[PDB]
Short mmCIF file of C-alpha atoms and ligand atoms in Angstrom, two decimals:
data_model
loop_
_atom_site.label_atom_id
_atom_site.label_comp_id
_atom_site.label_asym_id
_atom_site.label_seq_id
_atom_site.Cartn_x
_atom_site.Cartn_y
_atom_site.Cartn_z
CA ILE A 14 -18.38 -17.78 -2.70
CA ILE A 15 -22.36 -19.37 -3.82
CA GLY A 16 -23.23 -19.72 -7.29
CA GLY A 17 -19.44 -18.78 -8.50
CA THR A 18 -17.01 -20.71 -10.35
CA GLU A 19 -13.37 -21.78 -10.04
CA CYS A 20 -10.86 -19.38 -10.43
CA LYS A 21 -8.07 -19.70 -13.23
CA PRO A 22 -5.19 -20.97 -10.65
CA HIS A 23 -3.02 -18.18 -9.55
CA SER A 24 -5.19 -15.20 -11.78
CA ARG A 25 -5.79 -13.80 -8.51
CA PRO A 26 -2.01 -13.34 -7.05
CA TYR A 27 -2.81 -10.80 -4.38
CA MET A 28 -5.58 -13.48 -2.92
CA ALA A 29 -4.23 -14.18 0.99
CA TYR A 30 -5.80 -17.25 2.88
CA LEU A 31 -5.68 -16.86 6.38
CA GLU A 32 -5.77 -19.25 8.98
CA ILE A 33 -6.62 -17.77 12.49
CA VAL A 34 -5.56 -19.23 16.15
CA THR A 35 -8.09 -18.40 18.82
CA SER A 36 -7.90 -19.18 22.55
CA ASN A 37 -10.86 -21.12 23.21
CA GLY A 38 -11.54 -22.82 19.79
CA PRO A 39 -10.46 -24.70 16.61
CA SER A 40 -8.99 -22.54 14.13
CA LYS A 41 -11.04 -20.31 11.80
CA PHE A 42 -10.31 -18.91 8.45
CA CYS A 43 -10.64 -15.62 6.31
CA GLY A 44 -9.38 -14.31 2.73
CA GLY A 45 -7.64 -10.62 2.58
CA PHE A 46 -5.38 -9.39 -0.02
CA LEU A 47 -1.61 -8.24 -0.08
CA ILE A 48 -1.53 -4.42 -0.84
CA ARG A 49 2.50 -4.60 0.01
CA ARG A 50 5.22 -7.14 0.29
CA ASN A 51 4.76 -7.36 3.85
CA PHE A 52 1.26 -5.99 4.57
CA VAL A 53 -2.30 -7.78 4.14
CA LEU A 54 -5.30 -5.66 4.29
CA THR A 55 -8.76 -8.16 6.13
CA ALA A 56 -11.28 -7.55 7.98
CA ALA A 57 -11.05 -7.18 11.73
CA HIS A 58 -13.51 -9.76 12.73
CA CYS A 59 -11.02 -12.27 11.40
CA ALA A 60 -8.67 -11.21 13.86
CA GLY A 61 -7.25 -13.73 16.34
CA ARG A 62 -4.54 -14.52 18.74
CA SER A 63 -2.11 -15.47 16.17
CA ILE A 64 -2.61 -15.69 12.33
CA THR A 65 -0.41 -17.45 9.40
CA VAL A 66 -1.07 -16.39 5.91
CA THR A 67 -0.97 -18.24 2.87
CA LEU A 68 -0.19 -16.46 -0.40
CA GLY A 69 -0.01 -17.94 -4.07
CA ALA A 70 -2.41 -20.79 -3.46
CA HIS A 71 -5.51 -22.53 -5.30
CA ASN A 72 -6.38 -25.33 -3.88
CA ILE A 73 -5.55 -25.09 0.12
CA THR A 74 -5.21 -28.46 0.63
CA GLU A 75 -2.43 -29.33 -1.53
CA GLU A 76 0.93 -27.36 -1.36
CA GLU A 77 2.73 -26.33 -4.35
CA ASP A 78 5.93 -24.25 -5.09
CA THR A 79 3.88 -21.32 -5.80
CA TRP A 80 3.11 -21.10 -2.15
CA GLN A 81 4.31 -18.84 0.45
CA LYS A 82 3.36 -19.42 4.40
CA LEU A 83 4.13 -16.23 6.31
CA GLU A 84 4.22 -15.25 10.00
CA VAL A 85 2.12 -12.31 10.74
CA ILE A 86 3.87 -10.09 13.60
CA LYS A 87 1.29 -7.72 14.17
CA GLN A 88 -2.62 -7.24 13.84
CA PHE A 89 -3.80 -3.75 13.05
CA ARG A 90 -7.50 -3.72 13.58
CA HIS A 91 -9.24 -0.27 13.56
CA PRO A 92 -9.13 1.76 16.55
CA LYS A 93 -13.15 2.26 16.34
CA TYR A 94 -13.99 -1.27 15.79
CA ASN A 95 -17.33 -2.29 16.84
CA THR A 96 -18.55 -6.27 17.58
CA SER A 97 -22.09 -5.32 18.06
CA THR A 98 -22.65 -2.72 15.00
CA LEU A 99 -19.95 -4.37 12.79
CA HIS A 100 -18.76 -1.11 11.80
CA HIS A 101 -15.02 -0.55 10.51
CA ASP A 102 -14.54 -4.27 10.21
CA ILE A 103 -10.87 -3.68 8.35
CA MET A 104 -7.88 -4.71 9.55
CA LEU A 105 -4.05 -4.61 8.33
CA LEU A 106 -1.73 -7.61 9.05
CA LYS A 107 2.21 -6.76 8.85
CA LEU A 108 4.15 -9.53 7.65
CA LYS A 109 6.91 -10.80 9.24
CA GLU A 110 9.38 -10.70 6.14
CA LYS A 111 8.14 -9.37 2.90
CA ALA A 112 6.63 -11.89 0.20
CA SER A 113 8.42 -12.74 -2.98
CA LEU A 114 6.89 -11.20 -6.28
CA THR A 115 6.01 -13.89 -8.09
CA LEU A 116 3.49 -15.04 -11.16
CA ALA A 117 1.31 -16.60 -8.36
CA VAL A 118 1.79 -13.89 -6.18
CA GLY A 119 1.68 -10.03 -6.22
CA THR A 120 0.37 -6.95 -4.75
CA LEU A 121 -3.05 -5.40 -5.37
CA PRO A 122 -2.34 -1.46 -5.24
CA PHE A 123 -4.87 0.19 -3.00
CA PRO A 124 -5.93 2.38 -6.19
CA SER A 125 -6.58 5.90 -7.09
CA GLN A 126 -10.08 6.33 -7.84
CA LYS A 127 -11.65 9.51 -9.41
CA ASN A 128 -14.89 9.05 -9.03
CA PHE A 129 -16.90 6.36 -6.50
CA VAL A 130 -18.08 2.95 -8.24
CA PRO A 131 -21.85 4.08 -9.35
CA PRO A 132 -24.26 1.47 -8.35
CA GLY A 133 -25.49 -1.14 -11.30
CA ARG A 134 -21.65 -1.53 -11.77
CA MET A 135 -20.87 -5.05 -11.54
CA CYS A 136 -17.46 -6.05 -9.61
CA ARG A 137 -15.98 -9.49 -8.40
CA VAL A 138 -14.77 -11.69 -5.00
CA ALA A 139 -13.41 -14.10 -4.68
CA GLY A 140 -12.75 -16.55 -1.90
CA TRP A 141 -12.37 -19.91 0.07
CA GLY A 142 -15.72 -19.67 1.78
CA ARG A 143 -18.66 -21.84 1.62
CA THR A 144 -20.25 -22.32 -1.63
CA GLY A 145 -23.73 -22.80 0.14
CA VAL A 146 -25.65 -22.50 3.86
CA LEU A 147 -24.78 -26.34 4.64
CA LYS A 148 -21.98 -26.77 2.44
CA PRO A 149 -18.07 -26.73 3.74
CA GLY A 150 -15.53 -24.06 2.46
CA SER A 151 -14.01 -24.51 -0.50
CA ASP A 152 -10.76 -26.10 -1.25
CA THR A 153 -10.20 -24.28 -4.42
CA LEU A 154 -10.22 -20.14 -4.97
CA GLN A 155 -13.82 -19.09 -6.16
CA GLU A 156 -15.07 -16.43 -7.80
CA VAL A 157 -18.11 -14.47 -8.77
CA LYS A 158 -19.41 -11.30 -10.30
CA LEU A 159 -22.19 -9.16 -8.21
CA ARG A 160 -23.81 -6.33 -8.50
CA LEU A 161 -23.14 -2.95 -6.31
CA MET A 162 -26.75 -2.11 -4.72
CA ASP A 163 -27.90 1.03 -4.45
CA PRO A 164 -27.58 1.44 -0.48
CA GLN A 165 -31.40 1.04 0.46
CA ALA A 166 -30.54 -2.37 -1.02
CA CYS A 167 -28.64 -2.82 2.42
CA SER A 168 -31.66 -1.17 4.79
CA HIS A 169 -32.74 -4.35 6.50
CA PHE A 170 -28.94 -4.57 7.87
CA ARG A 171 -30.43 -1.88 10.71
CA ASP A 172 -26.74 -0.89 11.58
CA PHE A 173 -25.39 -0.43 8.30
CA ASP A 174 -23.93 2.82 6.79
CA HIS A 175 -23.57 3.97 3.44
CA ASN A 176 -20.22 6.59 4.14
CA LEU A 177 -18.85 3.26 5.60
CA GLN A 178 -20.04 0.29 3.77
CA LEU A 179 -20.97 -1.09 0.53
CA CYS A 180 -24.36 -3.26 -0.45
CA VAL A 181 -23.37 -5.94 -2.98
CA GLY A 182 -25.26 -8.60 -4.37
CA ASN A 183 -28.61 -8.42 -6.39
CA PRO A 184 -31.46 -9.79 -4.08
CA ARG A 185 -33.11 -11.68 -7.39
CA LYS A 186 -30.03 -14.09 -7.70
CA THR A 187 -28.30 -16.32 -5.07
CA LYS A 188 -24.95 -15.63 -6.24
CA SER A 189 -23.01 -13.88 -3.42
CA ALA A 190 -20.15 -13.92 -0.74
CA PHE A 191 -20.60 -16.07 2.18
CA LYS A 192 -19.29 -17.39 5.85
CA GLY A 193 -15.33 -17.99 5.09
CA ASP A 194 -14.94 -15.23 2.37
CA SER A 195 -14.85 -12.35 4.84
CA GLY A 196 -11.44 -10.06 4.49
CA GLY A 197 -11.39 -10.62 0.89
CA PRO A 198 -11.46 -7.59 -1.68
CA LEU A 199 -14.35 -6.76 -3.77
CA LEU A 200 -12.91 -5.66 -6.91
CA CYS A 201 -14.36 -3.01 -9.61
CA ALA A 202 -12.73 -2.60 -12.57
CA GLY A 203 -9.79 -4.22 -11.62
CA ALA A 204 -9.61 -1.61 -8.31
CA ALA A 205 -10.36 -2.87 -4.72
CA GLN A 206 -13.09 -1.05 -3.67
CA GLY A 207 -14.21 -3.19 -0.81
CA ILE A 208 -13.81 -5.86 2.04
CA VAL A 209 -16.46 -8.59 2.90
CA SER A 210 -17.29 -8.30 6.08
CA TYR A 211 -21.12 -9.98 6.76
CA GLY A 212 -24.47 -11.10 5.56
CA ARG A 213 -27.36 -13.63 6.23
CA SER A 214 -26.74 -16.58 7.71
CA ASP A 215 -29.40 -17.82 5.22
CA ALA A 216 -27.07 -16.43 2.58
CA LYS A 217 -29.94 -14.44 0.75
CA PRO A 218 -27.82 -11.32 -0.94
CA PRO A 219 -27.08 -8.35 -0.81
CA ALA A 220 -24.07 -8.53 1.79
CA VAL A 221 -22.29 -6.18 3.79
CA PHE A 222 -18.83 -5.09 2.34
CA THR A 223 -16.50 -2.38 3.99
CA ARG A 224 -15.98 0.61 2.16
CA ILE A 225 -12.29 0.88 1.41
CA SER A 226 -11.92 4.44 0.40
CA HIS A 227 -13.28 5.69 3.79
CA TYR A 228 -10.45 4.39 5.73
CA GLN A 229 -7.62 5.52 3.06
CA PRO A 230 -6.16 7.90 5.46
CA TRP A 231 -6.45 5.22 8.20
CA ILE A 232 -4.44 2.66 6.16
CA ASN A 233 -1.87 5.33 5.05
CA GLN A 234 -1.37 6.01 8.68
CA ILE A 235 -0.59 2.45 9.84
CA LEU A 236 1.71 1.56 7.00
CA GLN A 237 3.70 5.17 7.19
CA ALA A 238 4.10 4.15 11.03
CA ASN A 239 5.30 0.40 10.43
O1 DRX B 311 -19.86 -13.91 10.72
C1 DRX B 311 -19.57 -13.51 9.54
N1 DRX B 311 -19.18 -11.77 9.72
C2 DRX B 311 -18.83 -11.02 10.99
C3 DRX B 311 -18.85 -11.18 12.31
C4 DRX B 311 -18.90 -10.79 13.51
C5 DRX B 311 -18.64 -9.48 13.11
C6 DRX B 311 -18.15 -8.48 14.22
C7 DRX B 311 -17.72 -7.61 13.97
C8 DRX B 311 -17.23 -6.72 12.85
C9 DRX B 311 -17.65 -7.81 11.68
C10 DRX B 311 -18.06 -8.99 11.51
C11 DRX B 311 -18.35 -9.41 10.50
C12 DRX B 311 -19.14 -13.60 8.09
C13 DRX B 311 -20.77 -14.12 7.50
C14 DRX B 311 -22.01 -14.61 8.30
S1 DRX B 311 -23.12 -14.80 7.39
C15 DRX B 311 -22.37 -14.07 5.79
C16 DRX B 311 -22.84 -13.88 4.21
C17 DRX B 311 -21.85 -13.21 3.23
C18 DRX B 311 -20.44 -12.65 3.76
CL1 DRX B 311 -19.89 -11.93 2.36
C19 DRX B 311 -19.94 -13.19 5.07
C20 DRX B 311 -20.89 -13.74 6.17
P1 DRX B 311 -18.19 -14.99 8.40
O2 DRX B 311 -19.01 -16.41 8.78
O3 DRX B 311 -16.77 -14.73 9.24
O4 DRX B 311 -17.40 -15.49 6.88
#
């Protein structure tokens, strides 16, 4: 999270830190959120051979009682997930056991929106991602306020699609989501509306976020069958 501020410890109880294991490389990390006691929503590109979820965290370098490290038994990537266009970058992770509901760990009900969030509206995204282009990932959960842009603002991303994704982050500001924040939720009015997906390597906003609403039907499908 570039140009943001350190969250008030555990003020975002649904946040999930993800350590991802791959075959030919060191572990990678991503964000995500707890939508069910045993289900975490995140970005499809964050998929791996195996994944470990850590809920209730703030400073990920220091283990505390609020911590709940859980085993992921199954990774559900969207069937149409495309690595070249980056469309449908959404994944559901089913947990081994259900997490415990604490002050530091809870779910973020994938809502019920009466109307789509009009650009111009400010929303917020949190994460443990890099805080700059050549900066490392943050030890503590960062948070920043970003403006929902008109789809035109994301035109340069040749494969960006309004129906499928959200354009987030005013280009006139440096604030934005960055490497590492992927999988985290974008919250507008307290309701999850997006998932950090991608942006320019040089960090110039806007950034591309998956439009959750659009996949609500696929999400309920996976849930209902597992
Ligand atoms: O590389 C990225 N995302 C990504 C990489 C490959 C993908 C392939 C197919 C679907 C979605 C994909 C998403 C992410 C990224 C690179 S620059 C940038 C700027 C702002 C955000 Cl919020 C994320 C990213 P990450 O380094 O994993 O945080």
